[PDB]
Design a binder for this molecule. Structure first.
Ligand SMILES: *Cc1c(C)c(=O)n2c(=O)c(C)c(C)n12
Ligand SMILES: [Cl-]
Ligand SMILES: [Cl-]
Ligand SMILES: [Cl-]
Ligand SMILES: [Cl-]
Ligand SMILES: [Cl-]
Ligand SMILES: [Mg+2]
Ligand SMILES: [Mg+2]
Ligand SMILES: [Mg+2]
Ligand code: NI
Ligand code: NI
Length: 310
């Protein structure tokens, strides 16, 4: 009756407990174990943002709710979700091997990052497809980007509108919206990587839908290699825009991220908040989509559009 398909949901991964910080960051650092002071600092950061455990549940909740919602809203396909992570188990290759073992022959994949880049999305999709080729008997159709799905734009538009509506009059008249994603090396431009263009278009679409005429695009969370990374960084951008025009409120939409993790709860809600507190501006950062129903319905529409079924 219903056609069976795998639903491969890919994400960065998180530690599952404090004793996973060493192995998770060693993998991010390409085999270089963090020094003891860095391990201690990371433990402190996770404690300050409320703990690791809640963060580690979000991708699983996203994948489970997406599977169930997709199976309810149409009658042709029965999806089974499999989670594949970049930096901790279950890895991408573990998920594809499990699909193969379970008898899946046809799958659709989606990365829980809305903008395509050559560093992340393309690498996830290539890893998944290479593992399927090695095992045989299984093919994967991969979503490449989805930042322009109207239901996803509307998620952020409605959160921005609520934040502006909640402001005092003086803030509402002297506010700045900063839309951001995770920085990458500038060298991606040598490949024509559309990641920067897609961030700028996300920003255009969200500001336009919310009616916000004053906005800026920034980057966050750059690494420390000697080569230049995409900027400006959100901390510098905030201070610069303040020094130019004296905004009384900054609103942060880190549209490249879809789930609470350190790079939002720390790199925005601590590091950007340090800057806004220092300059006397109010700080707002609306909620990440996490596994909320409005977001799950946007993802389900992305998948069904990719398969040509809506
Ligand atoms: C890979 C990744 C994403 C998407 C994210 O939000 N975070 C973090 O907060 C860390 C520490 C890492 C890695 N990631
Ligand atoms: Cl791809
Ligand atoms: Cl696509
Ligand atoms: Cl794309
Ligand atoms: Cl919100
Ligand atoms: Cl919702
Ligand atoms: Mg313990
Ligand atoms: Mg597209
Ligand atoms: Mg940093
Ligand atoms: Ni720009
Ligand atoms: Ni990072």
């Amino acid at each position: 009756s219903r056609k069976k398909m795998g639903l491969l949901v890919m994400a960065c991964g998180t530690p599952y407990k404090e004793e996973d910080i060493e192995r998770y960051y060693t993998h991010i650092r390409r085999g270089r174990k963090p020094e003891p002071e860095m391990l201690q600092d990371l433990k402190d950061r996770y404690e300050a943002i409320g703990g690791i455990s809640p963060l580690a549940q979000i991708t699983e909740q996203q994948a489970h709710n997406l599977e169930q919602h997709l199976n309810e809203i149409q009658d042709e396909i029965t999806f089974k979700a499999y989670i594949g992570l970049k930096h901790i188990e279950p890895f991408i290759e573990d998920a594809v091997a499990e699909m193969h073992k379970d008898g899946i022959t046809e799958a659709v994949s989606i990365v829980l990052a809305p903008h395509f880049s050559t560093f992340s999305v393309q690498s996830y999709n290539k890893r998944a497809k290479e593992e399927a080729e090695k095992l045989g008997g299984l093919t994967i159709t991969s979503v490449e980007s989805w930042y322009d799905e109207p239901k996803f734009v509307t998620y952020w538009v409605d959160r921005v509108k609520e934040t502006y509506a909640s402001m005092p009059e003086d803030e509402r008249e002297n506010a700045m919206l900063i839309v951001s994603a995770h920085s990458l090396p500038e060298k991606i431009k040598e490949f024509g990587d559309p990641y920067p263009d897609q961030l700028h278009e996300s920003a255009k679409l969200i500001a336009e839908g919310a009616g916000v005429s004053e906005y800026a695009v920034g980057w966050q969370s750059e690494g420390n290699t000697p080569d230049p990374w995409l900027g400006p960084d959100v901390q510098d951008l905030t201070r610069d825009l303040f020094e130019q025009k004296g905004y009384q409120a900054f609103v942060y939409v880190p549209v490249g991220f879809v789930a609470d993790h350190l790079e939002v709860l720390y790199d925005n809600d601590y590091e950007c908040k340090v800057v806004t507190d220092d300059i006397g501006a109010s700080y707002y950062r609306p909620e990440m989509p996490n596994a909320k129903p409005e977001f799950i319905d946007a993802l389900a529409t992305v998948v069904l559009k990719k398969l040509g079924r809506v």
